[PDB]
Subunit: 326 residues, 4 copies
C-alpha cells in the first residue's frame, strides 16, 4: 500500500535544493538555509490560498447564508492567522544568517526577489488589496499562465467584496424592522445633548455625527481611505454592538479574525523590513508597505473611533431578541 | 536572468500536493493541511541534517582543532535549536484540524506514518541515538519499515561517527586534564574532600533542623565522591545510563567550572547548545504525543509516550553534571601560568 | 493631579517586592533577581487566570450560562486563559538564560521554600477540578491559617469540571421522548457494524481477511463499550473517567452536531477546555525539562515526582480527549430531520 | 525558615490590583486584565534595567577590559532580548480584550498612560536614546520629586551607547603602528574597485553594461565615503550616525575578523545590541497595532507610529555597516603575528 515518502511526494520536495553558489563551483553553506526558508514560506502561502479560496467559495456559492457553515468559516480564517503567526516567527530562523555570510552568495542570485512570488501576490489580491492603492508596476515581473492567474485574482470576487455583500444582509438594518441606523442616530443625538472648561465634547460630537454623513463616506470610498459600502459598515457595527446575541456571536469572531489577518500580514511585512535592514543597510519601499494603505479591513479597525456609552445603544425589545435566537 | 520560482524549484515544491481523498473521488479539505504540515517538517529536517553534517565534518576532518572555527560550530548548532523551536510551535497549526475532520480522510492514508520518515531517523542516528537503547515498536527494530538504498543510508548513519562520538573525542583533548599539567581531576578530588570536611565541622555545631542537614550532607557526600569512582562510570556506560567516556566527562566539567576563561567561553556555549537540542527534540516528541492523543485517543499513543524519556537524550551526561555542582570557593584556583594558556 | 500610571498600578508595591536573600546575607548574586521577577510574573498571571476562571465558574453556578447570549463571554474568557498559559509556557525561555552554575551560587539561601507553597497554583488546580486522591504522593500541609481555609473552599466549592458536567447533562437532543440521540446512535452503530461484518465474511478466506476480522472485533468491542453504563460507573470510581455518563452523551452530541448553530460556540468551549488541559501539562513538562538542567538527578526525589505530574492522571477533561476513540463514519451519525434542525 | 510567598513579597505583588471601575461602584471584568498586563510589563522592565545597569557598570568600572567577563556581558545582553521577545508576544494576551469591553472602563483611567512609565524612560535613556532624537510631543514634564531625579541621572550617567563606543575605540588592530586595519582596508577597497571597473569596461558595449557602470559608480561613491571622516562628523551632528568614527572602525574590524578567537564573543555582543534595537522597535510596533484596534484614529496613534523609525535605534550604525560589505578576497589578510595577538 501507501508509503510516507510517496504520499508526500518527497521525491519532489527534497530534490528542489540547488545552490547557485555550488552550480558556479563556489558552494556557500548558508545559501541552503536561504532556499529552505523561502520554500517553507511558499508551502504555507499555498496552504493559506487553499483555506482562503475555500472560504471565498463558501460566500460565492451562497453556503454562507446557511448559518450552520459559520463554524467552518471562522475555523479556516482563524487557521490562516495561526499559519501567519508561524510565518512571522519563521524570520527568527533566517536571522541566524549574518549579513557577512549572506554577502558571500548574494551575487549569485541577481536579479531574483520576493517581488516575483506569484503566491504572495495571489494572496494580497484575493484578500482585497486594490491595485491603485499599491505604492510604486507589480505585474511586469510575470508572464504566461502566471500573468493570467494574477489577472483572475484581481477580477474574481475578493474576500473583502464577499464579506461586504454578506455584511449588507445583516439582520436589523431594515428601516421597517429594528431600524438600527435610525435608532442609533436618535440615541447618539439625544446622548450628546445631555451635555473656561475643555469643551472637547464639540470634537466628540463632530466625530460621532460624521458617522451619519453618507456623502462623506462615498467621497472617502472613492479616495480609497475607506473600502466597505455604507450599508456593510452598518452591518459591522450592528454585529459589534449586539455581539452577545446568539446569531451575532460567531459573526463577531469572524470580524475579529479578518482584523487579525490584516494585523499579521502587516507584522509579516514589518519583520521582513527589520531583516532586510540588517542584511543590506529596497528598504524604503518595503517600509511604505507597512501602512493602513495595505489594511483591506481598515474600516473594521476604525469602528473603534465610534464607540459610545452602553446606555446609548438602542435596546432590543423581545421581538428582535427572538429573531437573533438560533 | 534568474527567476525566484526557478531558483527555488517551485515547479517541484508546489506540485507535490496530491490528496488521496480526491484521488478516490471524495476530496476532504483538511487533508491539504495534513500534507503541507508534513512537507514543511521534512524541509526543516533536511536543513537540520545540512547543519548537523557540516558540523560532524568539521570535527571529523580536524578543523575543530583550530579554535577560530568554534564561532561557526556554535552558530550552526544554535541555528538547529532555533529551527527545532519553530518545529515545536508548528504543531499549533495542525491542532486547528479537529479529530472529526481528520477522521474523514484518515482511512485513505493507511498504512503510512512518520515511522517511515527517513530524515527523522537520519537525524536521531547522526546526533547519536543508539539502536540498542531504542524502545521497540510491536517488538521490532525501527529499520524494518525501510528497504533498498534507504535501509543502506540508515545503516551508514548508525555506523559513521555521531555528533556524540565527535564531541566526546574533542572533550577528551580539553586543556587542563593532564596529570603532569593543571591536573584538574586530582585538584578537584582534593578540594571536594576538603570542602566536605569543612562543611561537616560547620554542621556539628542539638536541633532537628540540624539532624535533617546531617542526612542531607551524608547524601551530598555519597553523590560527590561517586564522581571519582571510574569503575561505577564504566559499569553505567555499558548499561547505557551514561554515554560519554570518563575522560570526556572531565573535559565537560572543566569547561563548566572554568567557562569564563576566554578559551572556554564558546565551548561552554556549545555544551549549552547540545543540551538545548536534546531539550527541543524531547519537546518535539512531547508535542507530537499531546496531539496524537487529541486525534486518536489511543498502542501508538503509549510507544510515543515512552520515547519522551532520558533513553533518547544523547547528551544526558551534560544535564546530569548539575548533580555534581559545588560552591564556587571549592573550584581549584588557576595560577598565572594556566590563566595564560587559556588566554 | 488626577490619576497617575504608577498609582493606578500600585507600582509602589509591585516594584518594591524584590529582596535578594543572597544580598540580605551579604553575598549578592546577580541572577537571583531574575529568579524572583520570573516567579512574580508567573504569580501575576496565575491571579489573572483565577480571575477569569472564578468569573466563568460563577456564570455556570448562578444559572446565567442557561441564557445562550452569555456563551461568547464564556468562550472568550476560557480562550483568554489558554492564551495566558501559552505565554507562561514560553516564559520558561527567560529562566533558561540562567545557567545551573549561576543558580547554584544562590540556591543555598532559598531553603526550604519552593513552588509547592504556591497558594495560587493549588487554587488553580483545584478550581479546574484536579481530584485529591488522584494527586501523586510527595500537599495541603505546607499551608496554615486563612490560606489553608481558602484551599479548603477551593476543594469544596463547585469545580469547572462539575459545572461543565451539569451543563453537559442538559444538552438538547438527549431526551428519549425527543431526538433520542443515544438510542439512535446505539441502533446506527449496531446496524453499521452488522453491515461491515457481512461485507467482510463475503471475502475469499485469506490472511488479509483474518487481520480485518481481528480489526473489526477490536472496533466492535470499543464502540459497543460506549453503551455499557456499568463499565462507565466502574471506571468513574477508579478515577479513569470524570464525567457522568449523561455529560459524556452531551459532549458527543456537541461533537457530532458542532455545525448546528446552537452547538458552534459550545464546541469551541469543549475545544478550549482540552486546550487548557494541554497547556497545563505543557507547563508541567517545561518546568520538569528545566529542573533537570538546574539540579540533575538530585532532590529539592524532585525531578522524578514532577515527571509523574505529566500524566493523564492530572488531565481534568481526559473524557473530552478520549471521545476521539469513539469516532464513526459520517453516515452512521443519526440524521437531523427538519424539526430538530429548527430546535438547534 | 523561608516561605515561597514571603520570599517573593506576594503580600505586595498580589495586593496591588485596585479596579478604578470597582472603586466608583461600576466594576468592569476586563479592567483586571488591563492592570495585570501592565504590572507584568513593569516587572520585566525592572529586570531589563537590572541586567542593563549591571552591564553598564562592567564597562564603567573597567572590568570589561578583562576579556574573562565577555561571556557574562553577552549572556545578560542576550537575556535582555529574550525578555523583550516575550514582552512582544505578551501583547497577544491584551488582544483578547475587545475595544467594546475596553471602552466600558476607559473613562475611569483618564488622564493616566504609559507616557508616565518611569521604567520605560529609564530604559530608553540607559540604552542611549538622546533628547534631540525624541519626537517632540518634553517627555520629562510628566514626572516630579525623586522620580524626576532618577530620570535626570539616567540622562546624565554614561549610556550603554557611550560605554560601548569607548570600548569599540580600543578594539585591537586599529593602531596605525600595528595591523593598521583602516589604512589596509582603504588600499584594498581602492584596488578592488579599480579591478571591478576594468572587468566591466571589458564587457561587450550594451545597455545591460551601462546599467552596471551606473551601479558601480553608485557602489564606488558609497564605499569610498567610508574613508571621509568629514562626512562622518556631518552625519553625526544630523543624528543619522551615533558612533565616533573610531568606534565604527572597531565594529567593522570585529565584523570582518569575527572568527578570530578574541573577536568571537565581541561579535555576539554587537549582534545582541542590534537584536535589542530590533525588539524595542517591534515592541513599539505591536503597541501601535493594538492602540489602533482599541481607539482608532483618536494624535495618539500618529505620535506612536513616528516612534517606529530608525531615529529611535541607538545602534543604527551597527545595522548600516551592512551597506559597506565587500567581497571576502578584499578583506586585508592577517599575517602570522596578528593571528597570534587575537588568540586568547
Ligand atoms: C536575507 C533575506 C531577505 C532579504 C535580504 C530580502 C530582501 C528583499 C528586498 C530588498 C525586497 C524589495 C525588492 C527587491 O529589491 O528585490 C524584497 C521583497 C520581497 N521579499 Fe524579500 N528578502 C529576504 C527574505 C525573504 C523571505 C524569506 C521571503 C519569503 C518569501 C521574502 C519575500 C519577499 C516578498 C514577498 C517581497 C515582495 C514584498 C512586497 O511587495 O510587499 N523575502 N525582499
Ligand atoms: C494528525 C496528526 C498526526 C497523527 C495522528 C500522528 C500519529 C502518529 C502515530 C500514531 C505514530 C506512531 C506510529 C503509528 O502507529 O502510526 C506516529 C509516529 C510519528 N509521527 Fe506522527 N502523527 C501526526 C503528525 C505528525 C507530523 C506532522 C509529523 C511530522 C514529521 C509526524 C512525525 C512522526 C514521526 C517521525 C513518527 C515516528 C516517531 C518515533 O518513532 O519516535 N507526525 N505518528
Ligand atoms: C530554576 C528554576 C526552578 C527550579 C530548580 C525548580 C525546582 C522545583 C522543584 C524541585 C519542585 C518540586 C518540589 C521540591 O523539591 O521543592 C518544584 C515545584 C514547583 N515549582 Fe518549581 N522550580 C523552578 C522554577 C519555577 C518557577 C519559575 C515556577 C513558577 C511559579 C515554579 C513553580 C513550581 C510549582 C507551582 C511547583 C509545584 C509543582 C506541582 O506539585 O505540580 N517553579 N520546583
Ligand atoms: C489597550 C491597551 C493600550 C492602549 C489603548 C494604549 C494607548 C496608548 C497611548 C494613546 C499612548 C500615547 C500616550 C497618550 O496619548 O496618552 C501610549 C503610550 C504608551 N504606552 Fe500604551 N496603551 C495600551 C497598552 C499599553 C501597555 C500594556 C503598555 C505596557 C507598559 C503600554 C506602554 C506604553 C508606553 C511606555 C507608552 C509611552 C510610549 C512612547 O513614548 O514611545 N501601553 N499608549
Ligand atoms: F504521510 C503520512 C501518512 C500517514 C500519517 C499518519 C497516520 C497516522 C495514522 N493514524 N491511523 N492511521 N494512520 C500520521 N502522520 C502521517 C504522515
Ligand atoms: F520561591 C521559591 C523558593 C525556592 C524555590 C526553588 C528551590 C528549588 C530547590 N532545589 N534545591 N533546593 N531548592 C524552586 N522554585 C522556588 C521558588
Ligand atoms: F495606568 C494606565 C492608565 C491608562 C492607560 C492607557 C490609556 C490609554 C487611553 N487611551 N484613551 N483612554 N485611555 C494606556 N496605558 C495605560 C496605563
Ligand atoms: C440568512 C443570512 N445568513 C443572514 C445574515 C446576513 N448577514 C449576516 C450577519 C450576521 C448574522 C447574519 C447574517 C444571510 O443573509 O446570509
Ligand atoms: C587544540 C584544541 N582546539 C584544544 C581543545 C580540545 N578540546 C577543547 C575544549 C575547549 C578548548 C579547547 C579544546 C584541540 O585539541 O581540539
Ligand atoms: C437552556 C440551556 N442553555 C441548554 C443547554 C445545556 N447544555 C447545552 C449545550 C449546547 C447548547 C445548549 C445547551 C441550559 O440548560 O443551559
Ligand atoms: C584589553 C581590552 N579588553 C581590549 C579591547 C577593547 N575593545 C575590544 C574588542 C574586542 C577585543 C578586544 C577589545 C580593552 O582595552 O578593554
Amino acid at each position: 500500500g501507501l508509503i510516507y515518502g510517496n504520499y508526500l511526494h518527497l521525491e519532489k520536495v527534497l530534490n528542489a535544493q540547488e545552490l547557485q553558489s555550488e552550480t558556479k563551483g563556489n558552494k556557500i553553506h548558508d545559501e541552503h538555509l536561504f532556499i529552505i526558508t523561502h520554500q517553507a514560506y511558499e508551502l504555507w502561502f499555498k496552504q493559506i490560498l487553499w483555506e482562503l479560496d475555500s472560504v471565498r467559495e463558501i460566500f460565492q456559492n451562497g453556503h454562507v447564508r446557511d448559518e450552520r457553515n459559520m463554524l467552518k468559516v471562522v475555523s479556516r480564517m482563524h487557521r490562516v492567522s495561526v499559519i501567519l503567526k508561524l510565518l512571522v516567527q519563521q524570520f527568527s530562523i533566517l536571522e541566524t544568517m549574518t549579513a557577512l555570510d549572506f554577502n558571500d552568495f548574494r551575487e549569485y542570485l541577481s536579479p531574483a526577489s520576493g517581488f516575483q512570488s506569484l503566491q504572495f501576490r495571489l494572496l494580497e489580491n484575493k484578500i482585497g488589496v486594490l491595485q491603485n492603492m499599491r505604492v510604486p508596476h507589480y505585474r511586469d515581473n510575470f508572464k504566461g499562465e502566471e500573468n493570467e492567474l494574477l489577472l483572475k485574482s484581481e477580477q474574481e470576487k475578493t474576500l473583502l467584496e464577499l464579506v461586504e455583500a454578506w455584511l449588507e444582509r445583516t439582520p436589523g438594518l431594515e428601516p421597517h424592522g429594528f431600524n438600527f441606523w435610525g435608532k442609533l442616530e436618535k440615541n447618539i443625538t439625544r446622548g450628546l445633548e445631555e451635555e473656561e472648561q475643555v469643551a472637547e465634547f464639540q470634537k466628540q460630537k463632530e466625530v460621532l455625527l460624521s458617522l451619519f454623513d453618507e456623502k462623506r463616506h462615498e467621497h472617502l470610498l472613492s479616495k480609497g481611505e475607506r473600502r466597505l459600502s455604507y450599508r456593510a459598515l452598518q452591518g459591522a457595527l450592528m454585529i459589534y454592538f449586539y455581539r452577545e446575541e446568539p446569531r451575532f456571536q460567531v459573526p463577531f469572531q469572524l470580524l475579529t479574525s479578518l482584523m487579525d489577518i490584516d494585523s499579521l500580514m502587516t507584522k509579516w511585512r514589518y519583520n521582513h523590513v527589520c531583516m532586510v535592514h540588517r542584511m543590506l543597510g529596497g528598504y524604503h519601499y518595503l517600509r511604505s508597505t507597512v501602512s493602513d494603505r495595505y489594511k483591506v479591513f481598515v474600516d473594521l479597525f476604525n469602528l473603534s473611533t465610534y464607540l459610545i456609552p452602553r446606555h446609548w445603544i438602542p435596546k432590543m425589545n423581545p421581538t428582535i431578541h427572538k429573531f437573533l435566537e438560533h
